[PDB]
Design an enzyme around this catalytic site. Structure first.
Site, PDB file in Angstrom:
ATOM      1  N   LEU A  27       0.835  -1.201   0.000  1.00  0.00           N
ATOM      2  CA  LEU A  27       0.000   0.000   0.000  1.00  0.00           C
ATOM      3  C   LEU A  27       0.869   1.250   0.000  1.00  0.00           C
ATOM      4  CD1 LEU A  27      -3.010  -0.674   2.411  1.00  0.00           C
ATOM      5  CD2 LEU A  27      -2.965  -0.675  -0.094  1.00  0.00           C
ATOM      6  N   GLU A  36       4.449   3.087  -1.338  1.00  0.00           N
ATOM      7  CA  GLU A  36       5.790   2.510  -1.240  1.00  0.00           C
ATOM      8  C   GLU A  36       6.469   2.913   0.067  1.00  0.00           C
ATOM      9  OE1 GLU A  36       8.045   0.606  -2.276  1.00  0.00           O
ATOM     10  OE2 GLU A  36      10.001   1.501  -1.868  1.00  0.00           O
ATOM     11  N   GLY A  37       7.057   1.935   0.752  1.00  0.00           N
ATOM     12  CA  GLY A  37       7.591   2.127   2.092  1.00  0.00           C
ATOM     13  C   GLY A  37       8.702   3.152   2.276  1.00  0.00           C
ATOM     14  N   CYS A  38       8.405   4.209   3.033  1.00  0.00           N
ATOM     15  CA  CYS A  38       9.366   5.277   3.320  1.00  0.00           C
ATOM     16  C   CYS A  38      10.400   5.017   4.421  1.00  0.00           C
ATOM     17  CB  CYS A  38       8.650   6.543   3.819  1.00  0.00           C
ATOM     18  SG  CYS A  38       7.761   7.559   2.608  1.00  0.00           S
ATOM     19  N   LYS A  59       2.027  -2.731   8.955  1.00  0.00           N
ATOM     20  CA  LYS A  59       3.322  -2.078   8.840  1.00  0.00           C
ATOM     21  C   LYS A  59       4.423  -3.004   9.348  1.00  0.00           C
ATOM     22  CE  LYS A  59       5.815   2.137  10.135  1.00  0.00           C
ATOM     23  NZ  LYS A  59       5.732   3.453  10.826  1.00  0.00           N
ATOM     24  N   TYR A  93      -7.870  -0.096   8.150  1.00  0.00           N
ATOM     25  CA  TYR A  93      -7.629   0.158   6.732  1.00  0.00           C
ATOM     26  C   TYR A  93      -8.499   1.291   6.189  1.00  0.00           C
ATOM     27  CZ  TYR A  93      -7.723  -0.612   1.659  1.00  0.00           C
ATOM     28  OH  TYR A  93      -7.675  -0.451   0.294  1.00  0.00           O
ATOM     29  N   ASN A  97      -5.273   9.250   1.105  1.00  0.00           N
ATOM     30  CA  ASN A  97      -5.187  10.348   2.063  1.00  0.00           C
ATOM     31  C   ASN A  97      -6.159  11.467   1.708  1.00  0.00           C
ATOM     32  OD1 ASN A  97      -3.735  12.542   0.423  1.00  0.00           O
ATOM     33  ND2 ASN A  97      -2.236  10.876   0.281  1.00  0.00           N
ATOM     34  N   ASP A 135       3.090  16.829  12.581  1.00  0.00           N
ATOM     35  CA  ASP A 135       3.046  16.889  11.118  1.00  0.00           C
ATOM     36  C   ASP A 135       1.614  16.766  10.614  1.00  0.00           C
ATOM     37  OD1 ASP A 135       4.170  17.217   8.585  1.00  0.00           O
ATOM     38  OD2 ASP A 135       4.420  15.062   8.268  1.00  0.00           O
ATOM     39  N   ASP A 143      -0.301   8.386  11.607  1.00  0.00           N
ATOM     40  CA  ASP A 143       1.039   8.680  12.122  1.00  0.00           C
ATOM     41  C   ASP A 143       1.083   9.586  13.345  1.00  0.00           C
ATOM     42  OD1 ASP A 143       1.705   7.200   9.955  1.00  0.00           O
ATOM     43  OD2 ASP A 143       3.043   8.694   9.040  1.00  0.00           O
TER      44      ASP A 143
END
Ligand code: A1LW9
Length: 291
Positions: free
Chosen positions: A22, A24-26, A52, A101, A106, A149, A167
């Protein structure tokens, strides 16, 4: 790994059907997945979840960072307007953190994909969006949590169009922040930061309320980019001069005044999320459903 067992949240690994990545992993990969019988008394139903995990090239710090985030969400507890912890896989294998989910991306994407040239959003819809995010932050602030953030990119939308803050427990060292580092959509995160957070690096609940102002601006600009074309160097200068973002078109004066109050130079004079919830609540009941 070295993880202690926690029967409150532990899920058997054979109850988690892993799916497609889901985004791309940062700093950590997130994948879609299916959980069989999360509900202890509904064990024959699958639930779509987000998982995650750690990348292959992950440090011991990356591990401890993921553990920290999981432990915080355990503490904060559940609320309708935040991405909630559903469970975890900690024993006999790699760490899996399972959260709710959100199928509709976003908030920024959600807002852009419904811009007039997918059904459009009414004036009531946009204010309702602001209300929900304000509620999620009210709860988080109530649990002594500071997001640092808050933005549309960190607000996810469920299948039922419910705003869920993401987050909020992300482990972040604020003494390493690359102000020049952009998001994957090419925006500078320093444009959401309050002045005392951008200059003195002082994060508070009031600095989050500043960010909510910029988030408010994102909403009524239907996912617009704050301060387009403006680099870091010039944003510093803008804030010194006490400059503020212009009023979005198709946005009431009351709502722009709300943004301005959120952008009060003196932190103590900004409204609380508790106030913002009450104000937006009244505005929702006074905003036309006919655009
Ligand atoms: C910086 C680039 C990047 O990582 N982009 C990116 C990755 C993954 C998605 C998809 N995605 N992420 C999440 C998550 C939301 C939360 C919220 C909290 C509070 C915690 C947490 O992990 C512990 C996660 S993971 C998604 C959810 N929940 N549903 C669908 N997609 C999700 C987007 C962008």
């Amino acid at each position: 790994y070295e993880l202690p067992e926690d029967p409150r949240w532990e899920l058997p690994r054979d109850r988690l059907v892993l799916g497609k990545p889901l985004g791309e992993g940062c700093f950590g990969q997130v994948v879609l997945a299916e959980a069989i019988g999360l509900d202890k008394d509904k064990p024959n139903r699958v639930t779509k979840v987000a998982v995650k995990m750690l990348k292959s090239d992950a440090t011991e710090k990356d591990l401890s960072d993921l553990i920290s985030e999981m432990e915080m969400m355990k503490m904060i507890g559940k609320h309708k307007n935040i991405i909630n912890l559903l469970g975890a896989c900690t024993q006999d294998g790699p760490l899996y953190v399972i959260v709710e989910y959100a199928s509709k991306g976003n908030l920024r994407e959600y807002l852009q994909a419904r811009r007039p040239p997918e059904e459009q959003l009414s004036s009531k819809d946009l204010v309702s969006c602001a209300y929900q995010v304000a509620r999620g932050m009210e709860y988080l602030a109530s649990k002594k949590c500071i997001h640092r953030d808050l933005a549309a990119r960190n607000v996810l939308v469920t299948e039922d169009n419910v705003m869920k803050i993401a987050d909020f427990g992300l482990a972040r060292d604020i003494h390493h922040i690359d102000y020049y580092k952009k998001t994957t959509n090419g925006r500078l995160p320093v444009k959401w930061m309050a002045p005392e957070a951008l200059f003195d690096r002082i994060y508070t609940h009031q600095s989050d309320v500043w960010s909510f102002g910029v988030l408010l601006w994102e909403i009524f600009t239907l996912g617009g980019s704050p301060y387009p074309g403006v680099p870091v160097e010039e944003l510093f200068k803008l804030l010194k001069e006490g400059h503020r973002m212009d009023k979005p078109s198709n946005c009431t004066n009351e709502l722009y005044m709300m943004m301005r109050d959120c952008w009060h130079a003196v932190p103590s004079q900004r409204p609380t999320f508790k106030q913002l919830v009450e104000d937006l609540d009244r505005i929702v009941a006074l905003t036309s459903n006919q655009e």
